[PDB]
A paper describes a structure:
In contrast, the NTQ rhodopsin functions as a light-driven inward chloride pump (called ClR). Here we report the atomic crystal structure of ClR from the flavobacterium Nonlabens marinus S1-08T. The structure reveals two chloride ion-binding sites, one at the active centre of the pump and the other on a loop in the cytoplasmic side, suggesting the pathway of chloride ion movement in ClR. The ClR structure comprises a short N-terminal helix, seven transmembrane helices (TM A–TM G), a C-terminal helix and three loops connecting the transmembrane helices on both extracellular and cytosolic sides.
Because Asn98 and Thr102 are the only residues of ClR directly interacting with Cl−-I, we investigated whether the interaction between Asn98 or Thr102 and Cl−-I is essential for the chloride-pumping activity of ClR. We expressed several ClR mutants (N98A, N98D and N98L for Asn98; and T102D, T102N and T102V for Thr102) in Escherichia coli cells. Of the mutants, T102N retained ∼70% of its pumping activity compared with the wild-type protein, whereas T102D completely lost its pumping activity. T102N's absorption spectra showed a blue shift in 1.5 M NaCl (λmax from 562 to 529 nm) suggesting that a chloride ion can bind at PSB but T102D's absorption spectra did not change in 1.5 M NaCl. We crystallized T102N and T102D proteins and collected diffraction data. In the T102D crystal structure, on the contrary, the side chain of the introduced Asp interacts with both PSB and Asn98, preventing the binding of a chloride at the Cl−-I site. Taken together, these results show that the direct hydrogen bond between Asn98/Thr102 (Asn98 and Thr102) and Cl−-I is crucial for the binding of Cl−-I, as well as for the chloride-pumping activity of ClR. We thus speculate that the decreased ion translocation might have arisen from the weakened binding affinity between the mutant ClRs and chloride.
Residue numbers in the entry: -2 to 265
The structure:
Amino acid sequence: PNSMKNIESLFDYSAGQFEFIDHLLTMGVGVHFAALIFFLVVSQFVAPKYRIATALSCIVMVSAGLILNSQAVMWTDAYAYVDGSYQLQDLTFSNGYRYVNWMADIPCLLLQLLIVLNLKGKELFSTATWLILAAWGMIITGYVGQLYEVDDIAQLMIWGAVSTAFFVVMNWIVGTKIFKNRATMLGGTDSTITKVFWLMMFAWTLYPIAYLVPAFMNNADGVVLRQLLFTIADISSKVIYGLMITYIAIQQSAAAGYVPAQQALGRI
Ligand SMILES: *C/C=C(C)/C=C/C=C(C)/C=C/C1=C(C)CCCC1(C)C
Ligand SMILES: CCCCCCCC/C=C\CCCCCCCC(=O)O
Ligand SMILES: [Cl-]
């Protein structure tokens, strides 16, 4: 369906190129699932005010891990090694699934941030609402644009412009809330959380770069590079970010007197 519309369909891949992609996707699932166990064992040390943030991390890990596992399988299904190269056998591969996943992943990532920020009640709800709508606006317009990567580069770029507008607006909101709510962080995670904003800024920005590969590197190597950028971005935005949110959650929990949090931080 969407497979003819992505640049992966245009090329034949060397055994090294095809195998590198498969290995990236495979490693990615391994990292996400390993992280998943860790987020899972560690959540018993998070006080309940914050425990939902850690659960969100586990949710993202599986959600992202499943999409990667599936991409890896869709990749091996799509091509066969014939006459010295991997050649397209059928229309089973597309990047469209990543976008669909982001529809779920991003709200989860944002919500875990708001929780450690100590937002609650009406503010949490309203902030969450504006953020996810902005995010959905970004993702959907982006999804529409990627559909035109094979045949209409101007069109991919215009949808890209619209997508970026939502992105910038989303960043302004998360940035503003982090900066206005820092003084309330305990432990003192007021310092850590600003690092979390910079990481997001860096990691999230890699997705747009990946989106533009058809525009500047329209060849088989470009395909490899985009999967690589997705990989760096995925580990940075989901896993590394997740480890920080959890750290902040544990630290805030101990500072507020939750004992399992204190014993845990202490036993290390
Ligand atoms: C777990 C997944 C994450 C954190 C994905 C984040 C994705 C983006 C920030 C996507 C951004 C885009 C633009 C701002 C412009 C082009 C289209 C997108 C969707 C790639
Ligand atoms: C910060 C997150 C780190 C992400 C992990 C990514 C791991 C891969 C890194 C480097 C390997 C580069 C080697 C590429 C050899 C090219 C072979 C070919 O494509 O033909
Ligand atoms: Cl609590």
